[PDB]
Amino acid sequence: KLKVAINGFGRIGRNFLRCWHGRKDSPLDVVVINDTGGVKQASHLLKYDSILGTFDADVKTAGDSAISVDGKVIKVVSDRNPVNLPWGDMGIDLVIEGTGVFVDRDGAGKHLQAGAKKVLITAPGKGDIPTYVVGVNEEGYTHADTIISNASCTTNCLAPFVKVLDQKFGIIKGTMTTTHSYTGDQRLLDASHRDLRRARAACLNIVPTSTGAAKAVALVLPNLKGKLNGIALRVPTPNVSVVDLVVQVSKKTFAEEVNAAFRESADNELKGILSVCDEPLVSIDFRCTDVSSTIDSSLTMVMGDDMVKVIAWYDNEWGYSQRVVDLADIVANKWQA
Amino acid sequence: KLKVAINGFGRIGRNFLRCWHGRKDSPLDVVVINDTGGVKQASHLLKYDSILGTFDADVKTAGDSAISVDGKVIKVVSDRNPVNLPWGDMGIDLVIEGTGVFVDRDGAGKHLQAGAKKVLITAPGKGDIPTYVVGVNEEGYTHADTIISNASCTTNCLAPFVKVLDQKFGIIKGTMTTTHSYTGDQRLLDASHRDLRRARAACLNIVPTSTGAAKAVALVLPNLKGKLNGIALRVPTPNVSVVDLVVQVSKKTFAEEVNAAFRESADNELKGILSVCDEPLVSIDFRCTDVSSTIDSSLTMVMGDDMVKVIAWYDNEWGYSQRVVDLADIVANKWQA
Amino acid sequence: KLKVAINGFGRIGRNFLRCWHGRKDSPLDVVVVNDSGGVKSATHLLKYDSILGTFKADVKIIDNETFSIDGKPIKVVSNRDPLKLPWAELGIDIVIEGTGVFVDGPGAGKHIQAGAKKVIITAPAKGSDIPTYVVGVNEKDYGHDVANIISNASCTTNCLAPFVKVLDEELGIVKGTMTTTHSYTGDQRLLDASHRDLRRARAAALNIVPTSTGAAKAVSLVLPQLKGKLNGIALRVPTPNVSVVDLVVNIEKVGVTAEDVNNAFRKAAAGPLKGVLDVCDIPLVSVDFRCSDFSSTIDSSLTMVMGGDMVKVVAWYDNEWGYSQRVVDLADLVANKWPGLEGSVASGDPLEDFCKDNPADEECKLYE
Amino acid sequence: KLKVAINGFGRIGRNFLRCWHGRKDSPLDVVVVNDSGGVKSATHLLKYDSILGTFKADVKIIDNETFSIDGKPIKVVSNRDPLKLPWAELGIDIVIEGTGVFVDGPGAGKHIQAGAKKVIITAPAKGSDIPTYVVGVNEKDYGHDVANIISNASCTTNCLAPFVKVLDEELGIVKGTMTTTHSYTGDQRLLDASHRDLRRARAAALNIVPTSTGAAKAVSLVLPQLKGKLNGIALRVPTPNVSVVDLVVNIEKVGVTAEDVNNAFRKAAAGPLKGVLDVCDIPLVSVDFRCSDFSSTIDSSLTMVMGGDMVKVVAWYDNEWGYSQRVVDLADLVANKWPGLEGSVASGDPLEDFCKDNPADEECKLYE
Numbered sequence A, B: 001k002l003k004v005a006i007n008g009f010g011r012i013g014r015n016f017l018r019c020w021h022g023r024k025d026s027p028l029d030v031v032v033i034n035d036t037g038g039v040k041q042a043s044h045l046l047k048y049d050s051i052l053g054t055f056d057a058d059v060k061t062a063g064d065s066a067i068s069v070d071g072k073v074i075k076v077v078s079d080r081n082p083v084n085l086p087w088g089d090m091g092i093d094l095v096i097e098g099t100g101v102f103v104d105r106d107g108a109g110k111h112l113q114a115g116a117k118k119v120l121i122t123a124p125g126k127g128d129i130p131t132y133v134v135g136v137n138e139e140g141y142t143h144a145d146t147i148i149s150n151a152s153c154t155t156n157c158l159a160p161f162v163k164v165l166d167q168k169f170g171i172i173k174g175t176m177t178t179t180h181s182y183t184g185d186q187r188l189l190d191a192s193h194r195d196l197r198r199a200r201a202a203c204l205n206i207v208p209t210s211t212g213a214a215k216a217v218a219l220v221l222p223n224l225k226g227k228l229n230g231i232a233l234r235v236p237t238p239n240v241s242v243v244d245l246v247v248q249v250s251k252k253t254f255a256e257e258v259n260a261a262f263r264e265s266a267d268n269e270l271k272g273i274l275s276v277c278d279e280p281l282v283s284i285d286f287r288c289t290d291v292s293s294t295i296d297s298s299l300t301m302v303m304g305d306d307m308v309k310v311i312a313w314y315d316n317e318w319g320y321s322q323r324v325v326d327l328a329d330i331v332a333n334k335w336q337a
Numbered sequence C, D: 001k002l003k004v005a006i007n008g009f010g011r012i013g014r015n016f017l018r019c020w021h022g023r024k025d026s027p028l029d030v031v032v033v034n035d036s037g038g039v040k041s042a043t044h045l046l047k048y049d050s051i052l053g054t055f056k057a058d059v060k061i062i063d064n065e066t067f068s069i070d071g072k073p074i075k076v077v078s079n080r081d082p083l084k085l086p087w088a089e090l091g092i093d094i095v096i097e098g099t100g101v102f103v104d105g106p107g108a109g110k111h112i113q114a115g116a117k118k119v120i121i122t123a124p125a126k127g128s129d130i131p132t133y134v135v136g137v138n139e140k141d142y143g144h145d146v147a148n149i150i151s152n153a154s155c156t157t158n159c160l161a162p163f164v165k166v167l168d169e170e171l172g173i174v175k176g177t178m179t180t181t182h183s184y185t186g187d188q189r190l191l192d193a194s195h196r197d198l199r200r201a202r203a204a205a206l207n208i209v210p211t212s213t214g215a216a217k218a219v220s221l222v223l224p225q226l227k228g229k230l231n232g233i234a235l236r237v238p239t240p241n242v243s244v245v246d247l248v249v250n251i252e253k254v255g256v257t258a259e260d261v262n263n264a265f266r267k268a269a270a271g272p273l274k275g276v277l278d279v280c281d282i283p284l285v286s287v288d289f290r291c292s293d294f295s296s297t298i299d300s301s302l303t304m305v306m307g308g309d310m311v312k313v314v315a316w317y318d319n320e321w322g323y324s325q326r327v328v329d330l331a332d333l334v335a336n337k338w339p340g341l342e343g344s345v346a347s348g349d350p351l352e353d354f355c356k357d358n359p360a361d362e363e364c365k366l367y368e
């Protein structure tokens, strides 16, 4: 029912698109979407994915203007300016900006300008957005935020458990790192990009970096700041990535102590959100997997009952979208506007 | 000058050989090899390398019985018996068993037991071998020590400065990890590997594991145990790995202060051994370079002035050889046993 | 129905239950495999593939050598020698060669007498003797219970062949040569590891090795009427699993366009060459066929002709998945091919019947 | 040196012993026959050849279980079922398939299960599983672990093979076909007696039979280079034991004189074919090579040519006698390949045999 169009029909565009098909009970009437890229491409792009494979969802469309897929015919155009991107022609309900290039509220404003009602950004918006993230900023979340954001998958995934750890054991200091994959955020080749590292090709090289995680943690976790700071490690992989953090937790504990604690959480709430296990499973074992990350039980060592390594294969793309999808439909509900 | 043979001779040995040549005035006259592989292959094994490209040195074999490299005749025995390999026709001084399968002193002794006299292994010598690594234990090594080994590249690489780590500030706790490359020891394609992780194909998946770095840490430095202990991560890369360690140091500090405290390290001890900088470089920008790593002084961030990040693209392969080739020279030096 | 098992455990040993359990028509059933690595592995192995994804199946760990498959159990062997493997006790009508070392039915025979009624050869066995078994071509033309060790040529050709078959079949072709994209695998080591061959020695997934393809000959082996007209090189390339050749072919016929032949594809693919031969139209890549069992993926558009007659003929394909479907191919075939009923000889006239018992009959000492 | 056993004495095996007795440094030794014929008879039958004269060596006919011969006390069984007959207590590494009856590969299992480790299959390639291995021809293709059940293909083939390589190898054929002058034997009914065969059923000693023989096939078996390329029926002619080949072949070569080819033969004879390929020059007949063991028998002249490409290839040879002294060499081959002996030459170059055991070595998995 939510007449929605997302900006930047990236993988996550397809993801949520697939999630639209994947997730059941989708009031997300996303009958339009934006990406300045070629739409029939995007169609085939939507049609054909690498990781989760081609979206076998056959779509029959008559004319460039109207496109229909799985009954839910869905428009899409290609343009840069959200004002040049008419939204009132549908009176758009929600937008998410997969481009990333609109990393400030103005574009959303500009999206709100052309006739959008609500906005969130999977990416941490530069500056003028208090982000919303499940587990962290979905509780005090208000549907009445016509413009909000998510953070990078990293934060979008690394959040809850350690907060609950912070809830159940506290953390003196946290040193978070990820196996952050590669994306358009980095240059395939050593193409000219602001971050020299993201500029490089690095087909097999990692990027020592720091995503908004150790920053968005501030918003999403009003407590865990500075003390609980690590960086990002943007790796030469395209796919589901892994958390790599060692904490100096506050309360004395040991490995399993958090595990069942981490278990029970997913056993009730991080259900769908996150997971935990110790069966050795590698990336391929996490295709289109939604429980953002199962945490290792063995290698999650604990030293002095505070120094605690943490590790979990996480879906930087689909589970991210999952999480992105999560509150997305939630704001569709409590549909104040 | 020191007659040497290499069992299980491999890349790192080939590296050591490309080292050996690059080691102008290599006091190891390594006129012998053990390698069950074919000679021209063994040539190409050294001759044609992937990472450092082919050996920039032409290889000539007369005709198949012996191969001469850089104007020096070389031999390569091939028999799975840890003794039958004729190390006595020369009465070998140093043996390097690549296979690592003799984590017990025995096989190495079995190598010595027909002419060989000294040993170092890529495998961490479990127990009945001096925990001997350059920067840390090559000195306390008295040349009477004959059969020693090197632990993990990681162990090997971290050793010197991580010793210097607790030097300059002391370390409350330490949990290290590597961006360890992919090799054939982990199943490059899915095969019967004990580690279910290392068992798959996983050309793009990581392997949670641990290392002698987590273990010899005590063996190389006593206090450095448990609290000073981490894990290993064999990652989808072929090349120079990075240390994923955050040291909970004792003395409060800020990042560069310790890097200042580690400028000197390169300036005095890590010279040749290790390096450090903050210009963003990637594994290829660490290729064939003997300073075992450069530390991301910048992103080796301080957090709470005790739990301090440590990050350094470390030469898991070439320096690893080099360090061993260094250690080899060390044992080429002080030659009594 | 037919008692099945696997010699050893491979990625193809990992390949088929994905099909088989996922299958709906498989009469036979495996009951045991030689995982010399433990069910825990084998499960983790089989439950979780590297490419086709985790097995969408409750293949579960019942007893360490007798696990579950969504309720169906299967035993496990753990060994590297036929002779101990009690295919007799296992009653296995059909076992799949998983050592490779059996480039010879003889070694496979070391299971035949061991209670293998028939032996599923999987790869191009250097033992020529076995009739070259390939679907769409000679699959039926195989003789049941005649030398029950049953060949299976290289997926590359084994997939190429029915296509390669249909072309001359559609055209008549002077001869042919090609080059597939042999995906990176284990046989070529991720490392520059000591190898009986210079090529697969090298660090695998970076270098790209052209190499030998008896599979090219295997065409003649399966297309004898096309003997000699075949060539090509085995380009080992760095992919997980898809190979694809373009086949240079001087077509004996006129030299009309390919689309016609592709219409003939569109005819014959849709004809008997369903299951194997796809001519998709959207120009698509490796991913676009993963987990897809259409055991050949031709691109009409991308395929071209040179002189109208020298046709540049391509086809995407996986290297084991489709191959794993070749398993079922004879499997259900050889199943119905299995007699089940009895014979109608005359142990007086066909006293060989009586001699089948009375083999020590001077009445029977033929050729011997 | 190796304990050997007979499941009833092979007509050839009988002399083969005396041959083996005529052998001196034999790494093998028979210890028992499954005499379902009475010792003294078998003894006489052994001590007395019916063709090349009785043994010129003592035979001590000791008790019904074990006579001796020149101090060789050899035991006696009497049974068609092996298992019971314990070649294991008899430590018989490899048992003479003294029946033929177990023409089926799986027949020999009972004999492995009767105390064999390997199996001297006396039978030509009735089954398909086991390949025979042939001196000068395909013997060396054997390593150990390769088919402990090992065929004794037809002398026809077995004498066909040796020279038949030269052509395809020294000079190159297109294809061709042959026909033995098969001496009379017992496996054709002396009179018209009830026998499942058409012809051999008829009265034997007087006539000749155009007769089915896949020796040409069995050659192509061990000569995949000739797989599905050659032909030939047999001719059971009335002689005790000798035969010559028909053989016509469209040689690929220009059509040089045979003499050179025969010199090349004689060269190749001088090569790997000592005792194997005789190319003599005296025009001689059946008698003139009886009890002569040189496996081939050609007055180099005799084999000749029509127009060069078509080659009138013909050569006398033995059907049992020489045939026997072919069995030992291969029977020796296993003992020559027997474990316990030091067999390390070079892996630093030729580790092919080294990792021939394990293809998952540093890198050994050729052909994936």
Ligand SMILES: NC(=O)c1ccc[n+]([C@@H]2O[C@H](COP(=O)([O-])OP(=O)(O)OC[C@H]3O[C@@H](n4cnc5c(N)ncnc54)[C@H](O)[C@@H]3O)[C@@H](O)[C@H]2O)c1
Pocket (backbone or CB within 6 Å): A007, A008, A009, A010, A011, A012, A013, A034, A035, A036, A037, A079, A080, A081, A098, A099, A100, A101, A122, A123, A124, A151, A152, A153, A154, A183, A184, A185, A186, A211, A316, A317, A320
């Ligand atoms: N976890 C994170 O770090 C994170 C979070 C949010 C967004 N992102 C970035 O956004 C993308 C998220 O993953 P993805 O699967 O969607 O990959 P993606 O790169 O395909 O998604 C971005 C899409 O926006 C399009 N784009 C660029 N400029 C545009 C513009 N003016 N208007 C409309 N579209 C525009 C791109 O073509 C692309 O299709 C990635 O590019 C990623 O770099 C990353």
Ligand SMILES: NC(=O)c1ccc[n+]([C@@H]2O[C@H](COP(=O)([O-])OP(=O)(O)OC[C@H]3O[C@@H](n4cnc5c(N)ncnc54)[C@H](O)[C@@H]3O)[C@@H](O)[C@H]2O)c1
Pocket (backbone or CB within 6 Å): B007, B008, B009, B010, B011, B012, B013, B014, B034, B035, B036, B037, B078, B079, B080, B098, B099, B100, B122, B123, B151, B152, B153, B154, B183, B185, B316, B317, B320, D362
């Ligand atoms: N480079 C590192 O950082 C590191 C660290 C720890 C262990 N290792 C081990 O060391 C090897 C990498 O070193 P490398 O580049 O010198 O190549 P390498 O792989 O050839 O060295 C060791 C190899 O010797 C082989 N082997 C067993 N028996 C042998 C025999 N008779 N003759 C010859 N080889 C035999 C083993 O397969 C083993 O992989 C890898 O096997 C790896 O597992 C490497």
Ligand SMILES: NC(=O)c1ccc[n+]([C@@H]2O[C@H](COP(=O)([O-])OP(=O)(O)OC[C@H]3O[C@@H](n4cnc5c(N)ncnc54)[C@H](O)[C@@H]3O)[C@@H](O)[C@H]2O)c1
Pocket (backbone or CB within 6 Å): B190, B191, B192, C007, C008, C009, C010, C011, C012, C013, C014, C015, C034, C035, C036, C079, C080, C081, C098, C099, C100, C122, C123, C124, C154, C155, C156, C186, C187, C319, C320, C323, D360, D365, D367, D368
């Ligand atoms: N897929 C093709 O088209 C093709 C063609 C020719 C050859 N091959 C080779 O034949 C095999 C078939 O593919 P796959 O899916 O099985 O991958 P695979 O490589 O895992 O299959 C063979 C593997 O099984 C194991 N093996 C061998 N003998 C064993 C035994 N007695 N017991 C337990 N394990 C044993 C080994 O790991 C061996 O590498 C592969 O080795 C493949 O490389 C494949």
Ligand SMILES: NC(=O)c1ccc[n+]([C@@H]2O[C@H](COP(=O)([O-])OP(=O)(O)OC[C@H]3O[C@@H](n4cnc5c(N)ncnc54)[C@H](O)[C@@H]3O)[C@@H](O)[C@H]2O)c1
Pocket (backbone or CB within 6 Å): C360, C365, C367, C368, D007, D008, D009, D010, D011, D012, D013, D034, D035, D036, D037, D079, D080, D081, D098, D099, D100, D101, D102, D122, D123, D124, D185, D186, D187, D319, D320, D323
């Ligand atoms: N002599 C040869 O060169 C040769 C070789 C192969 C086959 N053949 C033909 O096939 C038969 C075998 O010939 P051969 O050379 O082995 O001499 P053979 O005929 O004497 O061999 C069989 C002998 O073993 C016994 N026998 C037969 N079947 C048996 C069985 N199931 N179990 C135990 N003993 C059995 C008999 O005593 C018989 O004499 C003969 O009928 C012959 O015509 C001959």
